[PDB]
């Protein structure tokens, strides 16, 4: 099946990504707090709902929150400033707080039920966001010998997410706070730069060209 691409709102970042965030893939963004990772997660939740000539997939979003950083009014602001009805945009986001890593795994199973349900409608799920994906795994699996256990449990959770992405043609977007193995399709490092900008760099992506993207956090979410 054709790979769909969701615009980030930034032409610079979209170019770095090869056109946007891909369906049939897990894109991981990582960086320090305020680096743009979570602002990008909120922006994509709006952008996916747009028609393709506007950078979206005529889809809906699902958002797993692990550290209570989801802000519905921020989604409403981004939507309103892009010409969209804020409440209709918020209605196209399914939201869940993951209480712990085991609950996070169950939420991925439940996401499959909603994905299946909406698959052949005019607005299928096209984006599944997991914000600070590793937070509960780092809090719970700690101490002597915890590296192997944590990495196996994360590898399984990521394999579950890859299957949803591939089986249902959705984009899976995950964020993480800054030698460990990783299994996302594409990893993007974000940092603050000068002039209030954020800088993006692809990590271990020989398949994508050399460069860094520059973007701003605005009332439209993310843009150049
Ligand atoms: C202040 O106004 C609001 C208005 C809306 C929201 C969010 C966007 N919408 C909601 O919370 C809706 C309102 C009700 O219809 C239940 N609901 C779910 O989204 C319920 N979610 C689920 O049942 C559910 C299962 C499994 C899930 C699995 C996932 F991976 C991700 C999300 C998942 N979400 C917020 Cl945070 C604030
Ligand atoms: Ca952020």
Q: How far is CA 81 from CA 96, 195, 200, in A?
A: 25, 22, 24
> Determination method here?
X-ray
- 112 Cα–ligand 2 center, Å: 27
Domain ranges of the chain: 1-224
Resolution reading in Å = 1.5
Could you tell me which residues are annotated as the binding site for ATP?
Answer: 31-38
Q: How many CB atoms lie within 10 A of CB 73?
A: 9
| Ligand 2: centre distance to CA 51 (Å) | 25
Within 10 angstroms of residue 142's Cβ, the number of other Cβ atoms is 11
Q: Whole-angstrom Cα distance, residue 11 to residue 6?
A: 12
Residue 174 Cα distances to 10, 51, 62, 196, angstroms: 18, 23, 12, 23
Helix/strand/coil for 27: strand
Element containing residue 219 per DSSP (H, E): none
Whose tokens are 């991925």? That residue is: 108
Q: Does ligand 1 come within 6 angstroms of the Cβ of 112?
A: no
For residues 182 and 30, what is the distance between their CA atoms, to the nearest angstrom?
A: 12
Probe residue for ligand 1, chosen from 96, 170, 171 as the CB with the greatest number of ligand atoms within 8 Å: 96
Tell me the C-alpha to C-alpha distance, in Å, between residue 221 and each of 134, 153, 183, 184, 205: 24, 33, 27, 24, 26
Closest CA to 20 of 40, 5, 3: 5
- Exposure pattern of 22-37 as b/e (b: 16+ CB <10 Å)? bbbbbbbbbbeeebbb
Q: Identify the CA nearest to 84 among candidates 126, 55, 127.
A: 55
Residues 6+ apart with CB under 8 A from 208: 16, 17, 18, 186, 202
String of DSSP letters for 128-188: EEEETTTHHHHHHS-STTHHHHHHHHHHHHHHHHHHHHHHHT-EEEEEEE-------SEEE
Q: 198 CA distance to ligand 2 centroid (A)?
A: 10
């Amino acid at each position: 099946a054709t790979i769909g691409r969701i615009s980030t709102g930034s032409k610079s970042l979209d170019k770095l990504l090869g056109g946007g965030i891909e369906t049939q893939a897990i894109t991981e963004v990582f960086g320090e707090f305020g680096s743009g990772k979570t602002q990008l997660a909120h922006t994509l939740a709006v952008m996916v709902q747009l028609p393709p000539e506007e950078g979206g997939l005529n889809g809906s979003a699902m958002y797993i929150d692990t550290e209570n950083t989801f802000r519905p009014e921020r989604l409403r602001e981004i939507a309103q400033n892009r010409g969209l009805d804020p409440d209709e945009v918020l209605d196209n986001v399914a939201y869940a707080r993951a209480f712990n890593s085991n609950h996070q795994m169950l939420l991925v199973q439940q996401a499959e039920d909603m994905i299946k349900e909406l698959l052949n409608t005019d607005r299928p799920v096209k984006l599944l966001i997991v914000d600070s994906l590793t937070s509960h795994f780092r809090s719970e699996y700690i101490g002597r010998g915890a590296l192997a256990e944590r990495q196996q449990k994360l590898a399984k959770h990521l394999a579950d997410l890859h299957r949803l992405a591939n089986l249902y043609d959705i984009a899976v977007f995950v964020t993480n706070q800054v030698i460990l193995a990783h299994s996302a399709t594409l990893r993007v490092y974000l940092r603050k730069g000068k002039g209030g900008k954020r800088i993006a760099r692809l990590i271990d992506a020989p398949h994508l060209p050399e460069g860094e993207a520059v973007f701003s956090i605005t009332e439209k979410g993310i843009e150049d």
